[PDB]
Design a protein around this nucleic acid. Sequence first.
RNA 1: UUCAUCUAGACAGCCGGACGGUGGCCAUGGAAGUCGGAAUCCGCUAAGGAGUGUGUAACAACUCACCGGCCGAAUGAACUA
Lengths: 824, 52, 189, 94
Amino acid sequence: VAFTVDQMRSLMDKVTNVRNMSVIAHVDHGKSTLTDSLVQRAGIISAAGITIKSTAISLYSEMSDEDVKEIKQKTDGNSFLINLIDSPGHVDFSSEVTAALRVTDGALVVVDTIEGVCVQTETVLRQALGERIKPVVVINKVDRALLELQVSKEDLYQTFARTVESVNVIVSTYADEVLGDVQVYPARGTVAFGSGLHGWAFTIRQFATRYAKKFGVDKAKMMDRLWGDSFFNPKTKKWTNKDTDAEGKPLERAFNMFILDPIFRLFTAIMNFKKDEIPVLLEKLEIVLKGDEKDLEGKALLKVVMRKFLPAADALLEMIVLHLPSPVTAQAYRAEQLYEGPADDANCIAIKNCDPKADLMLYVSKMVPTSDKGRFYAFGRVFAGTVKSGQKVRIQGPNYVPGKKDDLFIKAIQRVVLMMGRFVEPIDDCPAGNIIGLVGIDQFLLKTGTLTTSETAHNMKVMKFSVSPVVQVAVEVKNANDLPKLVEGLKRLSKSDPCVLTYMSESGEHIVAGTGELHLEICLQDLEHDHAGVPLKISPPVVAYRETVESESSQTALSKSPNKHNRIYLKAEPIDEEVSLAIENGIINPRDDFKARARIMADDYGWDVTDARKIWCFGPDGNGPNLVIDQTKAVQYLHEIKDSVVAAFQWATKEGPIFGEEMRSVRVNILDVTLHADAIHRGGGQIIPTMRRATYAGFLLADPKIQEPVFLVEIQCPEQAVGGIYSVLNKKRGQVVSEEQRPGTPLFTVKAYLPVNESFGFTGELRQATGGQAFPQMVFDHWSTLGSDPLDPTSKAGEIVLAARKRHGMKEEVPGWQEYYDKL
Amino acid sequence: IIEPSLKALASKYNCDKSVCRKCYARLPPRATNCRKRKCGHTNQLRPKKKLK
Amino acid sequence: REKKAEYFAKLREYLEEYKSLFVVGVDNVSSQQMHEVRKELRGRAVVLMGKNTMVRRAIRGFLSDLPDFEKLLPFVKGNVGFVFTNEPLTEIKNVIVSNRVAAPARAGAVAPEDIWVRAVNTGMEPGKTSFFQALGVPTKIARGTIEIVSDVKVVDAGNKVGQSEASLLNLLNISPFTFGLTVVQVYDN
Amino acid sequence: KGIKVTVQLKIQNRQAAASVVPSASSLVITALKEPPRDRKKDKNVKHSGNIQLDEIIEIARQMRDKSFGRTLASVTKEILGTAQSVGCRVDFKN
RNA sequence: UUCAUCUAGACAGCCGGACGGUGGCCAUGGAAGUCGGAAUCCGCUAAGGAGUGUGUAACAACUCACCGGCCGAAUGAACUA
Ligand SMILES: CO[C@H]1[C@@H](O)[C@H](O)[C@H](OC[C@@]23C[C@@H]4[C@H](C)CC[C@H]4[C@@]4(C=O)C[C@@H]2C[C@H](C(C)C)[C@@]34C(=O)O)O[C@@H]1C
Ligand SMILES: Nc1nc2c(ncn2[C@@H]2O[C@H](COP(=O)(O)OP(=O)(O)O)[C@@H](O)[C@H]2O)c(=O)[nH]1
Ligand SMILES: [Mg+2]
């Protein structure tokens, strides 16, 4: 029940009565449609399974000060505003899941009795605990565990005892001990039971209430004697903590007879259209029906009876207020790993002693879309401060450090809006610890980022995710002219999604990367008709390797001027990895001092100062790993032609001879320099197709292959899932680098090597190998040398190479150095 | 839901067999020759391929 | 038939020399445990098992080295071997009825007695939790280590042990499916 | 001391950090040997050995889990040689 | 048409062991009898192969050979037409 902006604003002011959590679970456990019924029974109102682009439904309910004697925190209010932000379980769409955790203090988990605690449910439960968030064990779809399976009291309680101990294992391992004992116990009144599609849900505590004195002792001690080793004797009329009598016969556990039994009898009776027994028990539970309510029989019969018996939002929000967290207790030791560097800093202290009137702090993780003037609003949580409709505050970009200036934009917000389900409306204020939606900062911020008033503030924690972009794809247009619109669209997809990593490649294509192939085709779909608006052209990301020689070109190739005068002889030798690597590193620079650069290459990476100090080029563009040295010393016109040489050098070393790619770790050696008399005949106009045609023939006689790009794929995943990984990499030449793990947590973080041409759907085969348990974070490493010799179309890259010439529309296969050679 | 003695008995009459390499038919795992005459009563057999 | 004839002459050698002996029987035993026994007395009590080449040892009882072979042939049946010595029996009887301990729950072995165990924290991290899930036994986490909540009397006396529950009983130091290695007959001079 | 295939028993008592080495068959064939059989073969496969050692390898059998249950000098003549293709001692074990 | 071992105590059969070194030489991102080459050993007895396979990522675990219970005379293996 909300009234108005200010009335809802006044409840907000009390952060002690602010249950701010998220709902995570798994693909099909009934969490999205179940959260729909909670709002339709206790959501929000002010004076008026795929999670397809979600927001954050607010909502607020009523309690009592007597319920407040059981909550261990500093709460003094009775009206509570619970702001629940929707966060899609899955795993190939877990982008919004890591975002919610950080920008909230608590969290709900929709486990199941039948499908139970799944593999992804177990690892998504870890993200919430590895972030220091609190638990809500909601075992739903219990109507199908007693309607389309129908078990016994002691026995169904074992499917639930399993649900208990399964979600329980992720706790004692995939959690943090600073929160204390955050292990959800059903009896402790920390476990939720219920049916979301049929609006009813009850709790352990809910019946401890409707029982206490109707038993004789306090309801707290009794509801702890309701679950576990606890039996009641319908003969001694006493509570014996043994499962048999003074004879040795079977007993229906305390739980089985007091809670279960009634439900069990109600279950059947209503599901068996027997109103000849329905009223009798309908009476023991004080349930009344009138008019078209009793016009519904059997299924619909129990649907409305149990609602009026077990209250939806009520029961889950009973353990959400007396158990689930708010900023007050949460941020108390949550802000530690909510910030980096100075934890004793006064700005992080503002968050610890939550002061809306101090160091303004906020983190926008999401960016709720609505194409108007700019493009859409931002979405963050205030940790220490009140925001206003035009307030001037700074922006800490993903780079920005308190002592520099880059990624720091201090502007005034045009207006503020509070989220109500999916839509919002113009508000002006919101204090420390409450999640808000600040607009007008779209055309400034570069995605997830900080926003603080105090400039001396360091930098917070930049997300986490535990996924990383690994699905690779390339795009184009079916129609040549609409090409520009498609490109500004990747910019749009940047500002319409979280993990989506669009980038450019060495192919002249706009690359697309994401959580999954479904995910991809999902962004592709929301794009094809919206973001793009035209027929694209998708296909695996075209890969370019590097045309490199190695076995030291044995014969000297002959290339003279086009008139046939100035002849130069070259030998192609291999430049050491640590050597060519340093060119691209910024160690051995193309604008560095030769004497000191020679001391560097001679001592550290061993060579003779002669060819070391006489280097000339750094092909291609004078920054790549191709170095040219003068093997001569008696050239009458030494550097009087050095330029024309370095020129044709890069053009040829860039557009390759094998097929058409630049080269890598190759040292061109101008063994002999034979020139003409007059300098006019000795100009670039000849030296170009001479030095170029020289490396052309010298290349095809230096016995070259291709050093291609390798990935440093970090596959952090479960222990028994490791079986599947070994076999998968045992196929795609997976060269597993290391393999270490934390003794306690079974998750074994494993790093390896994977060929670029061996990964066009690689992620997919891993999860299929051992359930969505495996985790591939493919971070390209270096270039690992091959061995096949592509000058013959039997070599692996040999097929690749000819089709690349066939690709560009070239001289078919590889033309011999004889087709473009000089001599008798 | 499976359990040892239960998922074991189930396999004893579905997976614990021997697939003939000519006619494919189900024979006792501890077999040696086929009982069908369309294959000429062959001896070339192979246990029913397991699950990975 | 080569080694069958030489076995005769050899076992014949130790019986023709020593004063007192034991025709010890044992069905349930383990190879590794077995050699620990022969090493338990590598000199005073050297063991020597037998079979049908022991049905001829009764036809070697027909060979009659001494008349005392009468009191020997009526103990040939069951996995029964030998025990050679020349020291006072009470002292060495003490050792053979001290050489008797056994094996655990070999998944699908005999289940004769009642399977009852108490409830105290096991002392190991939550590991075989996926088994107690499809198994259904009340057990909660107490300081990381899995703690026994119920005095679970696992399997009822008289059945065939299930693969799953036997392996977790192994983690519980449960060894009751054998208990072998004693005497079948007692003989001297 | 010891490398290739690790068999090291470790007993713990909540914070109690203590280990007891079982010195496998790998450990004895390299324990008496000098430096080129202790190190320098990182990029090399270990395949040579003949030269006579003797009785002190009987106490080296006491380092290789004494759960064989028989005689010492007797079983040494077995392990080292057939499974031990380096430092064969007496070329009579195969 | 050929060789075993063969009531003395057989094979087909059901009943109890499948070991130490050993997570063997190396070889390993990983390999411990079962991805793998090269070695194919004796302590002991009734016996156990660096091991017959399944399956563990590798361990573990099950199992076969070898050998003890009983069934208790043949009847197994190799070939011809
Ligand atoms: C942080 O995210 C990272 C990782 O996913 C990984 O490092 C990835 O690697 C991309 C490639 C990097 C290679 C080197 C730097 C040299 C060659 C480059 C590639 C060209 O074929 C190979 C891989 C795959 C890409 C081809 C398909 C064009 C690369 C590229 O960016 O061009 O790059 C993204 C941005
Ligand atoms: N049998 C049964 N099905 C349910 C119940 N609640 C929800 N569902 C099913 O759950 C589906 C929606 O799941 P969703 O809410 O997408 O799951 P989530 O993505 O994990 O939140 C619907 O198609 C329903 O059929 C229930 O109480 N009983
Ligand atoms: Mg959903």
